[PDB]
Amino acid sequence: REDAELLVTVRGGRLRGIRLKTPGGPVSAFLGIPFAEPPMGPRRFLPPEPKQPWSGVVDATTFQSVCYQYVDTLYPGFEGTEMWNPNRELSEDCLYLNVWTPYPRPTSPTPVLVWIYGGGFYSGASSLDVYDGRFLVQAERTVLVSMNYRVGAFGFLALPGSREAPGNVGLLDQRLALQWVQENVAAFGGDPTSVTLFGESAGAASVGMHLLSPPSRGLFHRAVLQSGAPNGPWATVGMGEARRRATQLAHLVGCPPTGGNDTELVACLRTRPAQVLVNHEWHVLPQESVFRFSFVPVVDGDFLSDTPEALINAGDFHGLQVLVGVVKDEGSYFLVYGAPGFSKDNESLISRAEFLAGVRVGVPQVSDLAAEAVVLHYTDWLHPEDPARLREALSDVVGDHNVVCPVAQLAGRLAAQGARVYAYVFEHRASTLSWPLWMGVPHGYEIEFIFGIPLDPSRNYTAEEKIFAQRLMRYWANFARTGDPNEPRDPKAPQWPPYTAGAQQYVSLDLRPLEVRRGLRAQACAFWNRFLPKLLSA
Amino acid sequence: EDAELLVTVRGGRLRGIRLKTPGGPVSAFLGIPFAEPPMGPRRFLPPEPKQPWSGVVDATTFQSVCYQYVDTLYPGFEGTEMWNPNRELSEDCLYLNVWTPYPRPTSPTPVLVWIYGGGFYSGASSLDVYDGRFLVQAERTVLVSMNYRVGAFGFLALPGSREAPGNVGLLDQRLALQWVQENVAAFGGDPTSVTLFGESAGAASVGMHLLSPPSRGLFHRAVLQSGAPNGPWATVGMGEARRRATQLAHLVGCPNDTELVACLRTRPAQVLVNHEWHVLPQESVFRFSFVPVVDGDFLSDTPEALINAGDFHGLQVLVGVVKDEGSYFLVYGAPGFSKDNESLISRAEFLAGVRVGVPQVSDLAAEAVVLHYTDWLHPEDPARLREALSDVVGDHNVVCPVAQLAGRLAAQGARVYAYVFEHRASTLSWPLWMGVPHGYEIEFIFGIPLDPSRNYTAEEKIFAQRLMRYWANFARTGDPNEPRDPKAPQWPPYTAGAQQYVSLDLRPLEVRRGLRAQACAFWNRFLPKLLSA
């Protein structure tokens, strides 16, 4: 009749899950568990209300809907873009989370990994193939949780001060999910006293924001930030600029029939079909740019009491372990989304004039003086016009400014103020990668190795990549268990030393064994982190 | 009586002296007066041409050194005393010197004219290290050098006033160049082939004659060693010149420009000298109180402006620098530095040093300097900080201004040759940490190592001879390369794109690219934008 392993009771009522086959054995999956009331109609732009209790059994047996979001059409049918696109129907009814646990359920409480996806806060879903929790769970016997959270206007449109669209509700979705894990994860055999958040890009920035918001901070114990940071220039917005964008979006969809009463304005926004808001979303940004997203977390004194920069500098982080890193070519992926001269389908050997124009696109909303400073640092003045070098340098500009230097700065401050920090650079280019060779190791392409996706028999990774995947999964789960990625009791394997503000040590992750190196682009990030902000104040 | 040592010039008759060199004799005429003594009412005024004399001027010894400050940082030390005056001080100092082959040439011989450096506050044509005898004998040029007024005497300016118009030290130099045009043929020199060369403020001076049309017809080619007229230390604006002149007056008890200059003229020369260092705005190495002023007369615009606008087709220029331009200057005010230890400074000392070595810029400007010159993998390592501050000082004051001059001239039609001088003299008395310091290529250019009473190596004498040949080749033809010499490695012209220069040392010529191009991009391209906005 019924399999007891696939049956679990949580505070809201009863759940039925599914038994998944994995290469190494079975896993129990509870997919599409409701954790909030659907943020529908009157509840659009509002904080999540906890899911009301239910009688009977909810089938948590497949991923639920993707939150409404823009769908990338740059390269239709192309694997490199389609792998990030929604693989379920779009709906505002999307606040569901997923739990993977070993089969049979653990007898003693087990460390929990909680995944937060990225996607510039305008996109993403926990149902993407590349976030499939089944391989980590089988290989490392952790519990894995992932949640959907609202993105775009639905998650981060903000009219600061107003009760009808307070902003940051996407982050509140994540927090509600974290609360859910505390109350309920023990029913799946997981340890609420050992929870590790990990995320990539906007998900890493989310992880960092939970670090800096005290009501989140009690809900977990460690953090992993992959290729993103909360202090990233794309990751937050000021109250006034948020209002400006909300208001311009309202305006572009006929609300009201500009500004006025906030209650009236939001009520008119609530009568618009979801798809209509999505179609106008990209038209509210101040300047045309790769790498900037219309609706993002707002610094408003509530969720974030100050800018993440301030909060990072002022924080005491004793008792905290953090794992951070970047891929080898953070910037390259973004250039084909607007930098003049770039395409995945040619070598993108740009001119000097194209480089200068690309700097403005890749570093939006800085003064001319600031742009000149960037051109100075990044030009090789013995080869000022070599196209290949210019292509590489623009990739460096975009990557450094948006990912590498925000991460480096976070890493150095956390270390200096009490946290044990570990840092990596991911340097392996997947044999299956469909982006062109000039992009090197692009943003996002470590994720599939962390999740053990190469162990999927239907895919065509090499045996060495499968070994590599297993190494990474081991590092991540070691860190989740102990706060230290190093093998507890393995000596003759090279050690991953902590990252500190002085020595700035990190390891390279690739097919070769760990190599220790110094400095997360230290010379470059001194420009972005130490000097440029002094210039913007003058 | 030796007829070779008798010469008549426009003003009258002269008697010279025969000098010895290891390669044979040379004729020297030393202490030739080219101006009326700029004394009394003539202090601060433009030079007047020397009135004609009767009888024979004795031109057998160096004349007096123009009044200047005497360096007392290391009393008796060779490294400093070799630049100090070696004749008594006097305002009656406007004399020049001519060295010629013996017997005097009987066909037009190319002329080299030497303008000394010393920050526009010091220097003399009589210093041992500027001895013309070896170049003249070895390369068969005529060599001329002049004294010109320095310090307040040469560059005190109350702009708009006719009592202290400024730049008269530059006019001293021009008047000597005019003297060369009118009189050098009498020595066998060719007035249609005159090459100016100079080092530091002398190099800045050469550049300034390039950029001033009344000087430009007085010579044909130019050599700028470790200096440039666009140096941040080489000129001053009218407003700031007036302020400095005014603060000198106050410091020496003087109170209307006419009244002010009149009072200054009543003061003993030594009194002006004693106060000159104390008129500068802030504590600094590498800044000098009285320098050329940009007032629309001698210089119709800034040398930067003039350089960018100029048409320089038909000009050949030789420019260059020593391997370590900054190091010598650091012992004159950079905290932590001494010639008598390793000068392994702390980062606090480094940061303090940056404000001294790059004076009168905003905190933002200094921060940017500190950014570009810090190794952020090793922000506090003493040796690297010592080296980096040497780079800051040398790049800012010498290398990048020379690089900018070279680039602009080449791109606007000049043929430019560039070098880096990388040989450390076996006899050098400054510490090893200073490398090849400012000034220490000069002795090789003048062939001082051929002097048998000095202790240079055999290889160093051969190197001196190479350099004298390059310099003389350039003077004769606008090209330092050995005219027809196939298998010897060639010195290519410097261009804005390829930026090629050669290294000068005991090794054969080696071609390299870029005069600290990454660093000078900062000083020449970014930093001006910053200060403007």
Ligand SMILES: *[C@@H]1O[C@H](CO[C@@H]2O[C@@H](C)[C@@H](O)[C@@H](O)[C@@H]2O)[C@@H](O[C@@H]2O[C@H](CO)[C@@H](O)[C@H](O)[C@H]2NC(C)=O)[C@H](O)[C@H]1NC(C)=O
């Ligand atoms: C490299 O590609 C870019 C992108 O253009 C597209 O992709 C190419 C592979 C090719 O299929 C083109 O037909 C596509 O238009 C090129 O940049 C574009 O150039 C066209 C015409 O010159 C211009 O109208 C577009 O605005 C340009 N787009 C951008 C973003 O600048 C680029 O010229 C290609 N370089 C080559 C072929 O050397």
Ligand SMILES: *[C@@H]1O[C@H](CO[C@@H]2O[C@@H](C)[C@@H](O)[C@@H](O)[C@@H]2O)[C@@H](O[C@@H]2O[C@H](CO)[C@@H](O)[C@H](O)[C@H]2NC(C)=O)[C@H](O)[C@H]1NC(C)=O
């Ligand atoms: C290197 O020397 C400098 C210069 O100091 C002078 O010269 C020395 C050789 C020695 O004789 C010192 O006593 C002289 O004062 C040192 O910098 C000085 O440090 C003292 C304090 O120790 C300070 O009062 C002076 O102002 C400093 N001078 C300057 C120019 O800043 C420096 O400490 C020496 N380096 C060492 C010892 O490692």
Ligand SMILES: *[C@@H]1O[C@H](CO)[C@@H](O)[C@H](O)[C@H]1NC(C)=O
């Ligand atoms: C906006 O309109 C509502 C509805 O009538 C009313 O509460 C008030 O006029 C406005 N609300 C606020 C908070 O100003």
Ligand SMILES: CN1C=CC=C/C1=C\NO
């Ligand atoms: C498009 N996208 C969305 C989320 C994370 C990564 C990503 C792209 N990497 O190339």
Ligand SMILES: CN1C=CC=C/C1=C\NO
């Ligand atoms: C020796 N010295 C160095 C820089 C500026 C002025 C100076 C001397 N005049 O007193």
Ligand SMILES: CN1C=CC=C/C1=C\NO
């Ligand atoms: C002190 N001085 C004066 C003129 C030229 C060079 C010089 C010093 N270099 O060490």
